[PDB]
């Protein structure tokens, strides 16, 4: 399922730098109406045209309320254009790989070597989180929030 | 964001060149200089069966 | 034994902020084609003008592919001009000191107090990598990469 954020639909316009090499960042967040479950390709936010992540800070509230929680979040780039409500869209494990932020609601940063090696594209790609493993007891209305530090005009 | 027409988007116009590149004909050695009905011509022409 | 990057020579350039207090980043990377050896100094990139590091994010891959890894990178500010290819140029231990990343491969951020208290200089200063301990079995084609969040117009 696709749980679309404000930025993915386009109601909130994401910031894009003007100077080359400048660092910009807007926190991409949602308010989960329901309890997350495996397969939800949450389209948290969008990476603008010519940008590469330089640092990604992922913070969530306590997304599981069960002993030995299993919920894990994978953050990556998605294939199709932004805002297309088509289930045939796949996430990635680039920014984060089987991270365990949601077990205790902590904050972790990009700790994968592949995070900063993302290559450029010419069109607006969408950064979306996928719950690889379903939680033991899903939470009703907690918030998942990314923070992307992307730079334009890198060589 | 900022508007981008991208490269593979269906809104990126393309233009076709009207003028064609061609393979120039291989220059033929036996041009009209040689093939002549006169005697002094390398490749004589026999005109017997043209009208008969 | 300098292994000069495209940034140091002058082929690939480095951004400079046009406003004081504006974090600008450009991932300085090389692709060294020889297994690093003890005493090698690698000139990743140039710290332009009146700028100071704010956050350093090393992105070295697996440099040791043998048994008990021994490599210990450390980075600093090299003394001489950016472009001179003199082998006798020293490397400090400011941003990282005996950093243990590269034994396994991954990302390590600044964890030494010296990384944030760098002083300005009117010239261009080049950030260098020194391999303090020789690899047990060096890896050939891997890449090291450092990212500087240098900001101009500080105090």
UniProtKB/TrEMBL annotation, chains A, C:
This is Virion associated protein. It comes from Ralstonia phage GP4. It comes from the Viruses.
TrEMBL record, chain B:
It comes from the Viruses. This is Major capsid protein. It comes from Ralstonia phage GP4.
């Amino acid at each position: 399922a696709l749980i679309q954020s404000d930025f993915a639909q386009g109601i909130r316009m994401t910031p894009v730098p003007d100077c080359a090499g400048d660092v910009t960042a807007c926190r991409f967040d949602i308010t989960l109406k329901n309890a997350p479950a495996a397969g939800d390709i949450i389209e948290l936010g969008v990476l603008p045209g010519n940008a590469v992540p330089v640092e990604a800070i992922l913070d969530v509230d306590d997304l599981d309320t069960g002993g030995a929680p299993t919920i894990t979040l994978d953050v990556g780039i998605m294939s199709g254009p932004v805002g297309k409500n088509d289930p045939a869209r796949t996430c990635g494990n680039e920014l984060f790989a089987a991270s365990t932020v949601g077990q205790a609601g902590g904050v972790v940063r990009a700790t994968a070597s592949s995070a900063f090696r993302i290559q450029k594209a010419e069109d607006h790609r969408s950064v979306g989180v996928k719950v690889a493993a379903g939680p033991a007891t899903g939470a009703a209305g907690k918030t998942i929030a990314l923070i992307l530090f992307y730079v334009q005009g890198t060589s | 964001s900022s508007t981008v027409i991208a490269f593979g988007d269906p809104k990126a116009q393309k233009k076709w060149s009207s003028e064609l590149a061609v393979d120039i004909r291989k220059k033929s050695y036996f041009e009209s200089r040689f093939i002549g009905t006169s005697e002094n011509a390398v490749i004589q022409r026999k005109t017997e069966v043209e009208s008969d």
